Amino acid sequence: ADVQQKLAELERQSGGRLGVALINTADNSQILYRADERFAMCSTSKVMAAAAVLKKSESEPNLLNQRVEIKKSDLVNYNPIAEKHVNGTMSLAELSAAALQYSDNVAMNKLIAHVGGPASVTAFARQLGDETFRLDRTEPTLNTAIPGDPRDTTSPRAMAQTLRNLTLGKALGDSQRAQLVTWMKGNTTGAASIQAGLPASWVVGDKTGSGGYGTTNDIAVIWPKDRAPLILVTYFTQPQPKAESRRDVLASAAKIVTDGL
C-alpha cells in the first residue's frame, strides 16, 4: 500500500508515465506499477538481441568468433565503438559487448541482422514464453517512442519475467547465461539510473535506454548484500516529443521498491 502510494506520487511529480516491475527471488514476490502497459524499450531491447545471438551460439561454436565487417554504410547515429573499427571487422562477441556495455547502435544492428532480423528476435522471445515483447524495427528508428505506438514495445511485467529467465533461469545454457550476466555486470552506462537508487555496495547488471518523448529506461539484475537477487524494470516516458531524459525518476523508483531490502 505504502509502496504503491509512493510510486503514484513519483509518477505524478514526474509529469510522465511510469512502469515498474520488481521480482524478489527471496520470496517469489513482485511489486508492479502499470506493469501490463506497453512502453518503448529503446536500447533495453539490446539484451534480447544479445540473448538471441547467445542462444544461436549454443549449436554454433564458431558464432561468437565470426568476423563482421564495419562499413561506413553501417554507421547510424550513436556508434562509439563501431566508429573506431570502420573498414575492419569485429567479432560477434565484441559486437555483443559493445551493444550491452556502451550501447553502440551499429553493434545492435549487427546482432539483429545475424539472427535474422527483428522478427527473429521476436520469435526468440516467443520461444521463451514471452508473448508481449515485440521488436519491429532496427536502429536507429526503433527509438521513436511515439505515444500509442506499439512498435518496439514490451511491458514491465514481461521484461522482468524474461530478464529473470535469461540471467537467473534456464533460457540459456550455463556458459551463455554466465556470458550474458558478465556482459551486463560490465555495463558502463547505468550509474545514473537504477544503480543511483540502490546502496553503493549492491552489485548490478543492467541495460539502460532512452528515446523520443523523453523516454528513459533501465532493466537490471541486482544482488543486494547477503540477499537473494532481484530483477527490476523501470520504464518511463513523457508527453512532450522533445522532453529531456529523467534518469532521476528511475533512481527514485528503484529506491522506493527496494527500501527495506
Ligand SMILES: *C(=O)N1C[C@H](NOS(=O)(=O)O)CC[C@H]1C(=O)NC1CCNCC1
Ligand atoms: C538506446 O536507448 N539508445 C542508444 C544509446 N543508449 O544510451 S543508453 O541510455 O542506452 O546507454 C543512446 C540513446 C538511445 C538512442 O539510440 N537514441 C537515438 C540516437 C539516434 N537518434 C534518435 C535517438
